[PDB]
Amino acid sequence: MDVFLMIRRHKTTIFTDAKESSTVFELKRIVEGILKRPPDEQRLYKDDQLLDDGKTLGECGFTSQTARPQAPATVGLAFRADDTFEALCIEPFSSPPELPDVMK
Amino acid sequence: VLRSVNSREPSQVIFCNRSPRVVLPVWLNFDGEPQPYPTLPPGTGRRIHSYRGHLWLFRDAGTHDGLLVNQTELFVPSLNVDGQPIFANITLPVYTLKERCLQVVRSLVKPENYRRLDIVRSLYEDLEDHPNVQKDLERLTQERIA
């Protein structure tokens, strides 16, 4: 099965798909090709929880019901910076404006 | 031109609504005039009695948005094989983002207020141009000629 994701770190968002059977490590290889950082310098998260490399995306909660093309699931990303890993930080999207009078 | 042929040859069909919309089946009569038939709630199917050479189209019953039937616009009942009814699989098209956006905005704003939206002149004309079976029949007929 295909799962649809958003890999988010600070103000960067990667839109990608992967198999439910595929692993957290294979998702890191995808991030490595885009952001030029090896898997050892990356930490992936589902909410505040650090995901393990050998676990499948399905085992981490990424399924055809939660990770849809039109509503992808979020994977948090944190890079290593010198000695330590930086804290997980995801910049939110902008706030939509208030609904117009005629649209209420 | 786009009309049902009066064959009087029975054809058993299954109108299968594989979409999240309330579906309006529309039968083109022997003159080419669209004729509405009872609606189909989302995810339901109905066995209907139609005839070979009859023309059908399917719309959203409330907004008139164009839907697909067997991946195309028109469904034409055919001859059955060993008591197998013909499936008419009704699905949502992959609408353009623009058209999907026009649908949502039409569902939130009263038609008298479209011109009160803060948008380019062109987008008013797109909003005002409601989905219409008659306009679509004109488009299909022109596309069939050339």
Partner: protein, 87 residues
Amino acid sequence: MMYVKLISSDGHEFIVKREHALTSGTIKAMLSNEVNFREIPSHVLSKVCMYFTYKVRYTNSSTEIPEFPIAPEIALELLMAANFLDC
């Protein structure tokens, strides 16, 4: 596998597959690897990217197509973006 970067007015960087970005005729004309949209905020451009994924997944498919969702609050700006992007 090629990727393209679409940057929102508020500086959010969206990295999508090149094949998916070519869904927008406007974007396809600029590429045929980094595009800046000074008028499209992130709450709209993130949805534009979801649409590219939705379009590529469900175009020429017979597996029941779900509705593409649009919150009332983003509808107007997403309509403006879609009209410019030709998608």
